[PDB]
Every structure is written in structure tokens, then in C-alpha cells.
Amino acid sequence: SSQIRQNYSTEVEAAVNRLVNLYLRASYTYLSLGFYFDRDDVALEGVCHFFRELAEEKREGAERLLKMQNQRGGRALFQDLQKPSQDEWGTTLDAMKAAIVLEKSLNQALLDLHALGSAQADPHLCDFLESHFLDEEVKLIKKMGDHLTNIQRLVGSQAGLGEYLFERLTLK
């Protein structure tokens, strides 16, 4: 058992384990999104690469959370990783919408953990969440929103042309 654990509640420890599962689930979702856009009948490599890099970011998020759990003397517990919500992701517009929904859900979970850690008087936790996750989520969600606006502007008329152009001129 730990000899280091201090000011680290069992409620926070569990919530950290839930958040690890959420980040890993999000990484898996992004893996599926990435490979969908690599299908020969979809073939938007800029979209594939955008989602694959998000898969990596989310996995790294989970790993940072796991290192933090061990730094505080908590115990990592892993659960089943639920398969992604869809097997086919539609258009780049549909996929970007799905991505923002996913990210807002991760953000809301961070906010819920921060609130819990406030109620627990755990400032190391508040700080850790702030500096490596909350600012990153805000920045990511702004980029996604920007992309969604550009996609929408493009696929008002001539949807195929607009999807190609966004991929070619925004995504790489």
C-alpha cells in the first residue's frame, strides 16, 4: 500500500480513474474516425491525419492522468473500453460535429472533477487539471468550432467540392 498519499480522497481517486477511461474511449473513437477517412471510398487524408493526431493526444491525456494518480498514491483501475458510437462517420461535417460533442463531454468531466476537488480542498488536483487539460480542451474546441464553421460555409452548395477543398486547403 502507499506511504505517500496525502489530502487525496477516495472520491477524487475514483473520478480520476473514470476520466482515464473517458480519455481512452475518446482516443479509440478518434482511431475509428481516422481510419474511416482512410477508406478508399472516403479518401480524405487530411481528415484521417487530423483524427489520428487527436487519438494520440487523448491517449497522452490518459497517460498523464495515470502518472498523476500514482504520484498522489492512488490506484489505477481500468474498465472495459466501450467501442465508439458509430461504425461509419458520414461526412467531414458529421465527423467534426461528433468530435466537438466528444470534446465538450471530456471538458464537462474535467469541470466536474475540478468541482469535486474544490469541495475536497485539493489544490494540487485543481492545478494539474488546469494546466495540462482545461486550457488544451478550450483551445481544441475553438479549433474544432472554427473548422465546423468553414466546413458549413463550404458545403452549402456543391458539397463534394467543398469537402475536398477543406481537406486540401485547411487540413494540410
Binding positions are 53, 56-57, 60, 63
CB of 77 to a copy of itself, least distance (A): 6
Query: What CA–CA distance (Å, rounded) separates 27 from 33?
Result: 10
Closest CA to 162 of 96, 85, 98: 96
- Shortest CB 37 distance to Pd ion, Å: 8
Does 99 interact with a copy of itself (rule: CB under 8 A)?
A: no
Nearer to Pd ion, 159 or 171 (CB): 171
- What one-letter code names the amino acid at 152? Q
* Pick from 97, 86, 113, 106: nearest CA to 155: 97
Does the footprint of Ir ion cover residue 53 (CB under 5 A)? yes
Q: Is 49 in the site for Pd ion (CB under 5 A)?
A: yes
Rounded distance, CA 34 to CA 38, Å?
Answer: 7
Q: With binding defined as CB under 8 A, does residue 98 bind a copy of itself?
A: no
Q: Which residues here bind Pd ion, judged by CB under 5 A?
A: 48-49, 52
Binding site for Ir ion (CB under 5 A): 53, 118, 123, 126, 128
